[PDB]
Design a protein around this ligand. Structure first.
Ligand SMILES: Brc1c(Br)c(Br)c2[nH]nnc2c1Br
Length: 327
């Protein structure tokens, strides 16, 4: 399997662009940034809200904990390559300490609304507007030969007050290379594409479109995790119960994959449940014929069949968002 679009972008670019292991970061000054309060974490990092002590501007400080070398360079190089792109979080500086305690990434400030409280307030047009803005980020990173791999509500920061959208946390992002076998342990369970669930390792940018599709279904149908599995195996079962098992079998046959007999039985046999069955009076105002059509073109087993981000932008569902953008 090879990406339908932007498959050879990294080949055409110099080795330095995509060879992140050979990256010699230019460290800034840790003194220029004070850490104020933790909004951060404990996976591969801690995120805080701080200020730039040279202009008093707020910023986001991400401190990398027990996450050794490869990954850090990888995230830094992808961020530098994308800085300036439409709706891509902006890496302002990269600092550390002279003596020991290591890594810290500085970002432009971002101001969120726990997506769980925001999504219910979104109107039909707001969803169209924000998904379209997210589409600009993915088409840009993809055209730059980069896969995000962790698209989910938490990583799509939305400042509704300012109608601003930022795709954050590129810690799981990677450069795309034709035929390369990637790690499938990426994304968050509910947004994992079928490829990752059946171990199809030579995936591509289309993985992000499946994640986007899961978010979209979740937003228009008012069903937060649209595909709510309990584990990686049960995630595939939940997907099969909606898309149907006939399409799953076609996909496996095409890419020559055979499921673990215990997983195959677990998935079983299911008919395709039409998208209209998730519609109700609660989400009615968000559903339309075009919204169902768009979603249908994103949530396809076969990654090669899914709409690319660019093609997604021209779907009729966005025609209004697109027009307003003219002058
Ligand atoms: Br909250 C938050 C914000 Br804001 C940014 Br920016 C992040 N980048 N990586 N992880 C992040 C988290 Br958690």
């Amino acid at each position: 399997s090879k990406a339908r679009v932007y498959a050879d972008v990294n080949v055409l670019r110099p080795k330095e662009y995509w060879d992140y292991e050979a990256l010699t970061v230019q460290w800034g000054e840790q003194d220029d940034y004070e850490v104020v309060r933790k909004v951060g974490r404990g996976k591969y990092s801690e995120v805080f809200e701080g200020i730039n002590v040279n202009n008093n501007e707020k910023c986001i400080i991400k401190i990398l904990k027990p996450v050794k070398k490869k990954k850090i360079k990888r995230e830094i190089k992808i961020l530098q390559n994308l800085c300036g792109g439409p709706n891509i979080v902006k890496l302002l500086d990269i600092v550390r300490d002279q003596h020991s305690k290591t890594p810290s990434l500085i970002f432009e400030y971002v101001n969120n609304t726990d997506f769980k409280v925001l999504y219910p307030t979104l109107t039909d047009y707001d969803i169209r507007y924000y998904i379209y803005e997210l589409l600009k980020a993915l088409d840009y990173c993809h055209s730059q030969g980069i896969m995000h791999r962790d698209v989910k509500p938490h990583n799509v920061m939305i400042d509704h007050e300012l109608r601003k959208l930022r795709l954050i946390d590129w810690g799981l992002a990677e450069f795309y290379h034709p035929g390369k076998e990637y790690n499938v342990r990426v994304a968050s369970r509910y947004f994992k594409g079928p490829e990752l669930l059946v171990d199809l390792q030579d995936y591509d940018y289309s993985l992000d479109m499946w994640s986007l599709g899961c978010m979209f279904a979740g937003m228009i149908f008012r069903k937060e995790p649209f595909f709510y599995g309990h584990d990686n195996h049960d995630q595939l079962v939940k997907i099969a119960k909606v898309l149907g098992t006939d399409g799953l079998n076609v996909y496996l046959n095409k890419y020559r994959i055979e499921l673990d007999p215990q997983l195959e039985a677990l998935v079983g046999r299911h008919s395709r449940k039409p998208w209209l069955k998730f519609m109700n009076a609660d989400n009615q105002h968000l559903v339309s014929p075009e919204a169902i059509d768009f979603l249908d073109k994103l949530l396809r087993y076969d990654h090669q069949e899914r709409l690319t981000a660019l093609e997604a932008m021209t779907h009729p569902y966005f025609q209004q968002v697109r027009a307003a953008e003219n002058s």
